[PDB]
Amino acid sequence: NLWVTVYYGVPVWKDAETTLFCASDKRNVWATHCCVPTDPNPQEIHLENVTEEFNMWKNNMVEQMHEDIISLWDQSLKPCVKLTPLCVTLNCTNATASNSSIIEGMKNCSFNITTELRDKREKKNALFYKLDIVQLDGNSSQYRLINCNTSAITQACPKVSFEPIPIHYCAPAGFAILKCNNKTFTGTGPCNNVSTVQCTHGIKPVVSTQLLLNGSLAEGEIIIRSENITNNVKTILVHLNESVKIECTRPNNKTVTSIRIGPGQWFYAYGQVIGDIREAYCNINESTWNETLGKVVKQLRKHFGNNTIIRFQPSSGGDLEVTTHSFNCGGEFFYCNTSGLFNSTWISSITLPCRIKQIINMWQRVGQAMYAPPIQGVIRCVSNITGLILTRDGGKNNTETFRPGGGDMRDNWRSELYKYKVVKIEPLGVAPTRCKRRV
Amino acid sequence: NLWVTVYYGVPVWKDAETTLFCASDAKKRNVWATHCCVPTDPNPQEIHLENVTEEFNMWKNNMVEQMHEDIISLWDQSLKPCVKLTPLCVTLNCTNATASNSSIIEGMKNCSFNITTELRDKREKKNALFYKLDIVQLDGNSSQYRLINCNTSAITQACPKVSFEPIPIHYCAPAGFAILKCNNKTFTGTGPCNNVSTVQCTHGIKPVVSTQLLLNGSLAEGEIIIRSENITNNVKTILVHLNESVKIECTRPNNKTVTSIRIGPGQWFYAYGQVIGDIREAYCNINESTWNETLGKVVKQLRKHFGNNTIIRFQPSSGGDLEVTTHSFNCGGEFFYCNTSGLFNSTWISNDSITLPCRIKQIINMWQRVGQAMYAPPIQGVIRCVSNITGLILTRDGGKNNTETFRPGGGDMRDNWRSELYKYKVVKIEPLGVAPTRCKRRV
Amino acid sequence: NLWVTVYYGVPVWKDAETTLFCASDKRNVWATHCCVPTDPNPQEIHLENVTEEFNMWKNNMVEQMHEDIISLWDQSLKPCVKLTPLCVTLNCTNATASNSSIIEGMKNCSFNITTELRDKREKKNALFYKLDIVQLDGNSSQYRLINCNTSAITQACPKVSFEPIPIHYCAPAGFAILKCNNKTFTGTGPCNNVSTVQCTHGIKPVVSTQLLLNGSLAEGEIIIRSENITNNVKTILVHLNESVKIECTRPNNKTVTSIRIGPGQWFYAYGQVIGDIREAYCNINESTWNETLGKVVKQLRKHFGNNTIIRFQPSSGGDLEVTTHSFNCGGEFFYCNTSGLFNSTWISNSNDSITLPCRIKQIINMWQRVGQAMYAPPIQGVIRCVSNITGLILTRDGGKNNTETFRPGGGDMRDNWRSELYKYKVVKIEPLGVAPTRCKRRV
Amino acid sequence: GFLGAAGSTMGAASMTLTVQARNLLSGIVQQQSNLLRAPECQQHLLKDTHWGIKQLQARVLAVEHYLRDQQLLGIWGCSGKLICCTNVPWNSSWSNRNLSEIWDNMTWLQWDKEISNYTQIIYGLLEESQNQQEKNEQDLLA
Amino acid sequence: GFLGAAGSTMGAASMTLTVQARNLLSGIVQQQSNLLRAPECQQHLLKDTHWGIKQLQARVLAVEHYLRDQQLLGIWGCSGKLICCTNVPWNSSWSNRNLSEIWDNMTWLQWDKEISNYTQIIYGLLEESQNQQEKNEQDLLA
Amino acid sequence: GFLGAAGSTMGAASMTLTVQARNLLSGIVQQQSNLLRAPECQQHLLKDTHWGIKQLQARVLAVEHYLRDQQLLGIWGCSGKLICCTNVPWNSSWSNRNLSEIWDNMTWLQWDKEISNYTQIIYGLLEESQNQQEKNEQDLLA
Numbered sequence A: 001n002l003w004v005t006v007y008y009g010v011p012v013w014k015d016a017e018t019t020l021f022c023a024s025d026k027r028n029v030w031a032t033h034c035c036v037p038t039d040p041n042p043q044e045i046h047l048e049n050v051t052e053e054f055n056m057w058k059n060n061m062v063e064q065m066h067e068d069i070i071s072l073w074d075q076s077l078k079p080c081v082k083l084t085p086l087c088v089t090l091n092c093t094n095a096t097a098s099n100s101s102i103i104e105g106m107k108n109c110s111f112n113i114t115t116e117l118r119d120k121r122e123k124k125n126a127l128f129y130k131l132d133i134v135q136l137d138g139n140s141s142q143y144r145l146i147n148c149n150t151s152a153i154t155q156a157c158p159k160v161s162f163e164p165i166p167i168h169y170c171a172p173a174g175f176a177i178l179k180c181n182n183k184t185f186t187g188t189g190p191c192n193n194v195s196t197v198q199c200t201h202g203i204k205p206v207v208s209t210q211l212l213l214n215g216s217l218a219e220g221e222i223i224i225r226s227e228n229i230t231n232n233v234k235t236i237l238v239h240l241n242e243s244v245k246i247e248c249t250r251p252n253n254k255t256v257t258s259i260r261i262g263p264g265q266w267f268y269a270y271g272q273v274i275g276d277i278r279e280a281y282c283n284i285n286e287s288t289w290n291e292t293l294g295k296v297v298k299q300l301r302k303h304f305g306n307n308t309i310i311r312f313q314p315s316s317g318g319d320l321e322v323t324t325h326s327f328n329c330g331g332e333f334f335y336c337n338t339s340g341l342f343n344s345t346w347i348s349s350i351t352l353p354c355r356i357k358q359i360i361n362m363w364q365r366v367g368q369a370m371y372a373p374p375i376q377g378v379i380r381c382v383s384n385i386t387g388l389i390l391t392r393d394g395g396k397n398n399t400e401t402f403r404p405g406g407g408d409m410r411d412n413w414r415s416e417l418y419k420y421k422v423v424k425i426e427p428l429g430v431a432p433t434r435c436k437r438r439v
Numbered sequence B: 001n002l003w004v005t006v007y008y009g010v011p012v013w014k015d016a017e018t019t020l021f022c023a024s025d026a027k028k029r030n031v032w033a034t035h036c037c038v039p040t041d042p043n044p045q046e047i048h049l050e051n052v053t054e055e056f057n058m059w060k061n062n063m064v065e066q067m068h069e070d071i072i073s074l075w076d077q078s079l080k081p082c083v084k085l086t087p088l089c090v091t092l093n094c095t096n097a098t099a100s101n102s103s104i105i106e107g108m109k110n111c112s113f114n115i116t117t118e119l120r121d122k123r124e125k126k127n128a129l130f131y132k133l134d135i136v137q138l139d140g141n142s143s144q145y146r147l148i149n150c151n152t153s154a155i156t157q158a159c160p161k162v163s164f165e166p167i168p169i170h171y172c173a174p175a176g177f178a179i180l181k182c183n184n185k186t187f188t189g190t191g192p193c194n195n196v197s198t199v200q201c202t203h204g205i206k207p208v209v210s211t212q213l214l215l216n217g218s219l220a221e222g223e224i225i226i227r228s229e230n231i232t233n234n235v236k237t238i239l240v241h242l243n244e245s246v247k248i249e250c251t252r253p254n255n256k257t258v259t260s261i262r263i264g265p266g267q268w269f270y271a272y273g274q275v276i277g278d279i280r281e282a283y284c285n286i287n288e289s290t291w292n293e294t295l296g297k298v299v300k301q302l303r304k305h306f307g308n309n310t311i312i313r314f315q316p317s318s319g320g321d322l323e324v325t326t327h328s329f330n331c332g333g334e335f336f337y338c339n340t341s342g343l344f345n346s347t348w349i350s351n352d353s354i355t356l357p358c359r360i361k362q363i364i365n366m367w368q369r370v371g372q373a374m375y376a377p378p379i380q381g382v383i384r385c386v387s388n389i390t391g392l393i394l395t396r397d398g399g400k401n402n403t404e405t406f407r408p409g410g411g412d413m414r415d416n417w418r419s420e421l422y423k424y425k426v427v428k429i430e431p432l433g434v435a436p437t438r439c440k441r442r443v
Numbered sequence C: 001n002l003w004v005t006v007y008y009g010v011p012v013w014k015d016a017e018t019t020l021f022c023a024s025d026k027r028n029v030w031a032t033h034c035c036v037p038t039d040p041n042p043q044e045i046h047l048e049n050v051t052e053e054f055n056m057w058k059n060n061m062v063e064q065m066h067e068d069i070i071s072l073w074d075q076s077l078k079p080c081v082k083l084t085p086l087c088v089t090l091n092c093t094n095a096t097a098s099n100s101s102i103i104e105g106m107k108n109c110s111f112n113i114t115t116e117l118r119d120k121r122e123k124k125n126a127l128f129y130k131l132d133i134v135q136l137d138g139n140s141s142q143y144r145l146i147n148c149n150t151s152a153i154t155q156a157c158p159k160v161s162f163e164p165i166p167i168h169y170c171a172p173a174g175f176a177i178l179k180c181n182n183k184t185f186t187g188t189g190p191c192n193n194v195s196t197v198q199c200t201h202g203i204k205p206v207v208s209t210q211l212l213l214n215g216s217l218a219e220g221e222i223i224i225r226s227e228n229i230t231n232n233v234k235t236i237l238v239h240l241n242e243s244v245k246i247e248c249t250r251p252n253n254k255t256v257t258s259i260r261i262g263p264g265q266w267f268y269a270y271g272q273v274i275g276d277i278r279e280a281y282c283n284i285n286e287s288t289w290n291e292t293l294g295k296v297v298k299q300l301r302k303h304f305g306n307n308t309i310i311r312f313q314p315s316s317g318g319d320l321e322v323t324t325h326s327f328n329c330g331g332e333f334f335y336c337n338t339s340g341l342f343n344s345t346w347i348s349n350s351n352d353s354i355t356l357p358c359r360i361k362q363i364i365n366m367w368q369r370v371g372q373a374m375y376a377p378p379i380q381g382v383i384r385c386v387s388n389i390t391g392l393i394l395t396r397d398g399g400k401n402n403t404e405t406f407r408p409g410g411g412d413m414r415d416n417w418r419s420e421l422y423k424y425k426v427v428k429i430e431p432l433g434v435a436p437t438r439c440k441r442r443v
Numbered sequence D, E, F: 001g002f003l004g005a006a007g008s009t010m011g012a013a014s015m016t017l018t019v020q021a022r023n024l025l026s027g028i029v030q031q032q033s034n035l036l037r038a039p040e041c042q043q044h045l046l047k048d049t050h051w052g053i054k055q056l057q058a059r060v061l062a063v064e065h066y067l068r069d070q071q072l073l074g075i076w077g078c079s080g081k082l083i084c085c086t087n088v089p090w091n092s093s094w095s096n097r098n099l100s101e102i103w104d105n106m107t108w109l110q111w112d113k114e115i116s117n118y119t120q121i122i123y124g125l126l127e128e129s130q131n132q133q134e135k136n137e138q139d140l141l142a
């Protein structure tokens, strides 16, 4: 009695991977690259009686944005000035400010550089953070840029703004974005309250190593997500339901010196110091940090035992990018000592000193080093901590030690896209029915 | 009653923006032929549209912006693989350059300089002649000089075997689009056109570059036509299409020897060697009569938009860069800049020949862009070229007691292409439509 | 009466020129570029009663082959280190080895090179092949690299392998590859054993000049193919039915010195050789060569008449690219003097081995382009290649007097790719057709 | 006669419906592609990359619009038909005038604008009508 | 209301079929077109060759999937429709769910999963059936 | 075989027209499946921009040719069929064989050669016949 019938436009789909489109809302780099409106997307389609398995540890969207951000970064740096002539011998000394007060950083170096005429060199002076420079064979007052034995460095154009903006990722035709809405969802498994969208919400492509910045405030409850809570290989992400305010600052007021390299080529360095000497640092509310860690420890106890003792210790070792809290602030690049935060044990006005360096091997690549230009004037920025990156070491029974490991770069963004999945529409289907084609 | 019918293949269109493509007829290494590889129709067709009218706006036409973008993209593409004169920026001993019997040449300098060679550790002293307009003085009381480029950007030498002679380029729609051409002879833009035809490609436009006069264009079928985005607002430019051209000669008469240097591994730099013959100067010769009747007809037609008794005065450009103050153009690969003082000094109320002095400049800030400047290579021999002025670019100064002053002004290359694109409009076919009917669907 | 009926899905086709793609199965360029996986079980389908005309010297696939490969070499060298800072005057002497043995062919050359800091330079020393170096001026130990007056040179990346691997060439949809299975096919005319295939059998991109290496063997006898056997202007391709083993080697054990150019740029050269010097050479079995040359001579007799004299002489002239047999051996570049071969007389028709002295070069202008040279990195140790000769490239003289003299050819690598692709053609499917039938649409 | 008689009359468009339908797609882009390939310009298409991406943009957009049109005809039950009628009645609000007053007294390009803002409603009615018709034909298939 | 009936039981999605037919092609493609056309997107991103190539590839693949699906509808006969039956009996061995639950108490997602591994067999049957039908019609006319 | 009987006989060859039409797009989807299995291959071939433009051009050209054929079928009233008959008679000017001389004893390739210059005339006549039939149908629906 039953006969084949073919239906076109069935509302079903399969898992897939595809290039999603990037859209957003002197110049901001993302706005030009993702130069397409996102305003006319006010609605979502709730799906009645659908269950779908999410896996935030196998999202291809996070990989896509990693490759997209690095591609954008490379493209934006590509036409900018090169600093190869600055890889010369430097005659260096201690810098000073006010009544000849020596600066902790700020090696003052002089260098012979070629001007617009190839047959003409001039001595020029510049101050540099001590972390960008390496001594030449232990000889006094002989130094080179840290780059000079790796690759040529590019100066980021001062006119472009690398401040992240909200980014929306939109399905191409024949594809859709499924978003879980279960507020207690732990990043993996079935979700039975799902809404389909054409575009994601606004996620800022923030960069950070060990603390999670300027993100969404998790859900109503603090959520700890892991591909395996037991395994020590996997990074542990903590998602806070309340933001923690942090005020980071470079207080030193300085002049910026503008040097000509060649035809149409300009270099910018830190010139004379204007104000008095003060360290770069971040301020964090001590009490707030305490109850936040307490709540996170309670949620950890829910996984590791109610009678378990849980302690936090600093990151064991590695490059600044591994152990320091690395980030951008006002266009400058900070690396902060977080040992004053992750030193505690649990049974049942914090000032982070901060180093600043201008030459960065972002994404731990060999070569392709970026030189951050200086910024004239004091820098002060405020950020919301929304989550944490924790590394579990294991050890003795009923002892749980976690450290603020930097994790992978992708973990900075898995923290934001855990709700999202991409699906390919499969409009074609077949079924039996009582009806049969005539003739 | 009435019901809906859906027709597919309806003949309608809407105004649209789209990329186009460019085609040229088959013919050393002329870049225009290379880029517009697509061959044209040997028998181009035109379909007259009976009882059709359409609004054209020559100042909002996407064709010209595509023109600017495509032409600049091609120029950058052509210069991209050519030799770089980046290392050629050193202190220069320059002195007065002389020809034949030690006779001074105004506007040139014999410059000696130290230059690299094949081996990076070997240098050599080399000599070359340069124009004053390409050189700036390092020390006001000495003979050290440099090239004007050196404080903006490195310069690229155009490839010596690549011709830049303009060729007619026909501009064609992709599928689904069409080009609508006005056939109203006195059409001034910004309005309806009654006599309209559909085409697939334009008539063939020579991408000629000029600043003060329109060269090698098309002539107006009727009388002289004056076009403006805003005739009353004097800030806008004024395009004048002539119905009779003016034949102008221009020449660099001095017979120059060309020399070449191996500046790098396969990098050749060309320059002007010594010179021979008597001293001669670059100029543009114009028939004084034909100019005067042309300008007389132009003022007569200006009096259609300005008062009959209004005084019409013509003055040179007040000032600015050499590119816009002068009449700038290309002659056989060389770049000419001519004063035009003898063309625009007159007042109009109710055997002879003229000559414009001209200057030669090899460093070109093409498209008024900062940096990325081009070095036009030297040309062996003596340069003579002839061109038809077909139209003029004029700016206006008012606020006078029933008097209007006009100057060349201009300088925006877009307007040049407007002179051959006011007729055309791009449209997108919308083959889907509906209509009422007396008919009904069955089953 | 008969009425039109329209058919879609027809099995007919036309000759066509289309874009193919490449699929093949330590950073080998070939595996990377042809990363598309191949069919493990290609399904050749014999087309019964189908005949197809082939003409391998009009086969457009060789052009696509040539363009794709040269693009691959150019792209692989794109990120690699430039050696332009090294083009400096060289202080050279005779190189030496253990016990001060005078090495033939090398030079110990020293040069001042810029270190990581651009304001400092250091003296470095390295061995080079004398064939890659020319005296800077007159007769002074001052010497330069041959390239320095032609173009900048890029060293091939030492971590990148260029070993040939079989490459299968696959059509896009709507195109099919017709394969001819006539074992006796001479490269032109009808073929009566035609099958369809998706991808070619797998052709290794071997590059050689005089003798065809590593190729496929003829199914039948030895086949001699040429557009005009009478017109000796064309080359002649010998496809053998039996292969010949050839053993080539650079036997001296060398080491490699690693010199910094710049921040991430490293130049590599032969630091030293141990001793017990001997020349690089190839070796061929004498009896195998004599028998193979006799069989090809029999086929030449078949073409040119039984009572005709045949003779073989070395190459008439040209550079090393065409006079010698050149090949790539593990990344190094051999050029062997084939005078020991092709020296014979044949009129109506020895347990030793033929030795071929071989010059070796690091500076290669691949594909005989001016500029864009490539510097082969050194290889530590001892180099040994083993190869199968499967064919020959010959040219014919015009001496007449009843004698046809033959010489090694070469100079156009396209013949090399063609030698393998003689039996494949690409055809576009045309699904549409019409025919008459004994009925009409009801309407 | 591409766009021929565009100003003549909407009633007797007739053969013009064919003429447009075959000159808005690959039936001319084949000519464009053969012309493009003929001088072996592919290297330019590769060297001048920007021009290449622009050409591919133009071709894919033309293809996308043609498929736009074919899908809209298909969902309306008008696949493979130049003139097709439906069962959706004409509304008085859609610039109602007697056929004696508009049919053969008015041409395309003069009255398309007179039914703007009603394209979407007509399209929605057509899809709903076609879907209901197809479901009814299914149910009748006893 | 795209995918609005995905979790509804089979048959509830019939009236939504017209909605689901759109946005595969020409529902999102023209939206993305105009959205990218307004800010000359890709036009000033032509220099970002990677980005342009990716977007062109994605649009091409949307087109190609649409053509594949439409052509498979063609080769089974009765294309241009959201609903159509064939003359091929159902092989109950595939699921043996010979119930009214084919139009109740189960969603299309679940069904597509349940018979996910008999897709090719159904396709081949439809192919042969249309071949026989076309030849039969040609013979009947002749 | 895929092109089996192409050089044998028209009648037997015409039985299997399914495989060709299927492969015109199934080759494309199979090759892109091969690429999708290896995203690193897509990444390199993306970085090799020239290869990307080459094969994007190839794919869009294949799509173009398929749509060319499909729309030509559409204007002839043969959309959704591999076999269809019209009301255009056969002109003796170009061929005078009878059916037994062509549907047996001759190959489709030979047939393509036989009417190579008649076929465009058939395109024109089919277009006009379909337009006339459509106008007749429109006037019929009273």
Ligand SMILES: *[C@@H]1O[C@H](CO)[C@@H](O[C@@H]2O[C@H](CO)[C@@H](O[C@@H]3O[C@H](CO[C@H]4O[C@H](CO)[C@@H](O)[C@H](O)[C@@H]4O)[C@@H](O)[C@H](O)[C@@H]3O)[C@H](O)[C@H]2NC(C)=O)[C@H](O)[C@H]1NC(C)=O
Residues within 6 Å of the ligand: B028, B163, B165, B166, B208, B209, B215, B216, B329, B330, B331, B332, B333, B385, B386, B387, B388
């Ligand atoms: C407006 O249109 C006019 C034509 O109606 C243009 O006049 C033409 O201008 C060209 C360019 O100068 C002249 O071309 C001639 O070409 C020969 C051929 O020379 C070849 O060999 C030399 C060897 O050194 C090589 O340098 C060349 O590139 C060629 O490969 C030259 O020898 C001549 O000197 C001369 O340049 C035409 O002759 C000329 N036409 C006429 C009738 O005189 C005019 O240029 C256009 N206006 C503008 C502004 O472009």
Ligand SMILES: *[C@@H]1O[C@H](CO)[C@@H](O[C@@H]2O[C@H](CO)[C@@H](O[C@@H]3O[C@H](CO)[C@@H](O)[C@H](O)[C@@H]3O)[C@H](O)[C@H]2NC(C)=O)[C@H](O)[C@H]1NC(C)=O
Residues within 6 Å of the ligand: A163, A164, A204, A206, A213, A214, A329, A330, A331, A380, A381, A382, A383, A384
């Ligand atoms: C997290 O979000 C906050 C709030 O948006 C960000 O604060 C912003 O920080 C940037 C960079 O310091 C500020 O831009 C600066 O503005 C001044 C004044 O125009 C200008 O002189 C500087 O050159 C720079 O452009 C921005 O005004 C500021 N916005 C607010 C409202 O605080 C913070 O940077 C974000 N942090 C992360 C991790 O993304």
Ligand SMILES: *[C@@H]1O[C@H](CO)[C@@H](O[C@@H]2O[C@H](CO)[C@@H](O[C@@H]3O[C@H](CO)[C@@H](O)[C@H](O)[C@@H]3O)[C@H](O)[C@H]2NC(C)=O)[C@H](O)[C@H]1NC(C)=O
Residues within 6 Å of the ligand: C213, C214, C327, C328, C329, C330, C331, C383, C384, C385, C386, C387, C388
């Ligand atoms: C084709 O011609 C090439 C030379 O043009 C011949 O190359 C040689 O191929 C053999 C294949 O077994 C290589 O053997 C292996 O090479 C690797 C390279 O690192 C080595 O590690 C292994 O221990 C082993 O020796 C051989 O190296 C290679 N020659 C060189 C100098 O590397 C090839 O034999 C010819 N025939 C075919 C079928 O390719």
Ligand SMILES: *[C@@H]1O[C@H](CO)[C@@H](O[C@@H]2O[C@H](CO)[C@@H](O)[C@H](O)[C@H]2NC(C)=O)[C@H](O)[C@H]1NC(C)=O
Residues within 6 Å of the ligand: A044, A045, A046, A047, A181, A182, A183, A193, A194, A195
């Ligand atoms: C399931 O998802 C829907 C959205 O698809 C949620 O509905 C939202 O509920 C919040 C409650 O504050 C409202 O503010 C939103 O406006 C609602 N949106 C829509 C579209 O309905 C629903 O709350 C979710 N329920 C669960 C179980 O998480």
Ligand SMILES: *[C@@H]1O[C@H](CO)[C@@H](O[C@@H]2O[C@H](CO)[C@@H](O)[C@H](O)[C@H]2NC(C)=O)[C@H](O)[C@H]1NC(C)=O
Residues within 6 Å of the ligand: A094, A095, A096, A097, A108, A109, A110, A125, A127, A271, A272, A273
């Ligand atoms: C960094 O060093 C430079 C070089 O000495 C200082 O510049 C000048 O130094 C001379 C003495 O050598 C003084 O007479 C000038 O007055 C200095 N001029 C400037 C630029 O101030 C420079 O001051 C040093 N900067 C710091 C912060 O110590």
Ligand SMILES: *[C@@H]1O[C@H](CO)[C@@H](O[C@@H]2O[C@H](CO)[C@@H](O)[C@H](O)[C@H]2NC(C)=O)[C@H](O)[C@H]1NC(C)=O
Residues within 6 Å of the ligand: C134, C146, C149, C150
């Ligand atoms: C570049 O230099 C090479 C080598 O110094 C030159 O090659 C010579 O060409 C002549 C031509 O007659 C030969 O006789 C020589 O044997 C070649 N080699 C030597 C030893 O010079 C080449 O001609 C030069 N060309 C350029 C443009 O620089």
Ligand SMILES: *[C@@H]1O[C@H](CO)[C@@H](O)[C@H](O)[C@H]1NC(C)=O
Residues within 6 Å of the ligand: A092, A093, A094, A102
């Ligand atoms: C900088 O000051 C410190 C103070 O301890 C001293 O040790 C060091 O040698 C000084 N270096 C220079 C360059 O003056």
Ligand SMILES: *[C@@H]1O[C@H](CO)[C@@H](O)[C@H](O)[C@H]1NC(C)=O
Residues within 6 Å of the ligand: A284, A285, A286, A287, A288, A349, A350
């Ligand atoms: C921290 O927050 C509390 C909130 O009551 C506030 O009273 C206290 O002054 C804050 N201290 C810091 C570190 O700013």
Ligand SMILES: *[C@@H]1O[C@H](CO)[C@@H](O)[C@H](O)[C@H]1NC(C)=O
Residues within 6 Å of the ligand: B221, B222, B223, B224, B243, B244, B297
């Ligand atoms: C140009 O127009 C003027 C208008 O007065 C007319 O006198 C003159 O003859 C025209 N010349 C040509 C060549 O058409």
Ligand SMILES: *[C@@H]1O[C@H](CO)[C@@H](O)[C@H](O)[C@H]1NC(C)=O
Residues within 6 Å of the ligand: C090, C091, C092, C140, C141, C142, C143
């Ligand atoms: C090489 O250097 C030695 C060092 O004494 C010197 O004698 C010799 O002349 C130099 N040769 C050249 C060619 O520079």
Ligand SMILES: *[C@@H]1O[C@H](CO)[C@@H](O)[C@H](O)[C@H]1NC(C)=O
Residues within 6 Å of the ligand: B050, B051, D005, D007, D008, D009
């Ligand atoms: C244009 O209008 C005239 C008016 O009499 C008419 O005769 C002619 O047919 C119209 N053109 C077309 C193409 O129908």
Ligand SMILES: *[C@@H]1O[C@H](CO)[C@@H](O)[C@H](O)[C@H]1NC(C)=O
Residues within 6 Å of the ligand: C048, C049, F004, F005, F006, F008, F009, F012
């Ligand atoms: C080829 O021709 C022979 C003639 O006897 C026939 O038997 C055979 O079927 C033909 N091939 C095909 C594929 O029809």
